[PDB]
């Protein structure tokens, strides 16, 4: 989801039990109002966004990525807010081989302190 | 006449089922209430130039 953010409202309670957030997101051709819950609230707070700084957000990932300020410098982004695409990933066979070897085997991609991977994994 | 009245009652029961299912879909189960009687912070980002 990418567009020119217009309004951001955050309603967090001090010594309370809940928080809330309301956003106004608008493109050149349409606008819609949405209300946030918990994950996107903390993602927005941790990555500082104002009325002038424009963003991309994924539903499943939940990650909030800066797309450059429109002002305060680019024109208003066009097109529908929703965008479905595909992202490709290339992983060499050795890295799948090692990633499943041990619970700490992922670090061997960097430190390399692995070896003698059991033949029952290959 | 009694059968016409029964038909009317059947039709209004059917529309009652319709209205009940639409109301069930539109009612939601929101139990958040994130206001409380306690201090709470608000931040607003917008544009103001008159």
């Amino acid at each position: 989801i990418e567009g020119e953010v217009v309004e951001i409202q955050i309603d967090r309670s001090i010594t309370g039990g809940h928080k809330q957030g309301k956003l106004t997101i608008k493109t050149t051709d349409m606008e819609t109002i949405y209300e946030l819950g918990n994950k996107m609230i903390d993602g927005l707070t941790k990555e500082k966004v104002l009325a002038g700084d424009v963003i991309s957000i994924d539903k499943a990932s939940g990650k909030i990525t800066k797309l450059g300020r429109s002002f305060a410098f680019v024109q208003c982004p066009e097109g529908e807010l929703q965008k479905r695409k595909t992202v490709v990933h290339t992983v060499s066979l050795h890295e799948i081989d090692v990633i499943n070897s041990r619970t700490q085997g992922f670090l061997a991609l960097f430190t390399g302190d692995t070896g003698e991977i059991r033949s029952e994994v290959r | 006449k009694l059968n016409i009245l029964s038909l009317d009652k059947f039709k209004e029961q059917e529309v009652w089922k319709k209205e009940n299912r639409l109301a069930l879909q539109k009612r939601q189960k929101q139990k958040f209430q994130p206001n409380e009687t306690i201090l709470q912070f608000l931040s607003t980002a917008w544009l103001m130039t008159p």
């Binding site: 309603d11 002038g52 305060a72 410098f73 | 201090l39 709470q40 912070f41 608000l42 917008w46």
Partner: peptide
């Protein structure tokens, strides 16, 4: 129109 250092209201809630 992007004037000033991005005014951000700091509001309190509730009375």
């Amino acid at each position: 129109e992007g004037p000033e250092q991005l005014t951000s209201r700091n509001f309190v809630t509730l009375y």
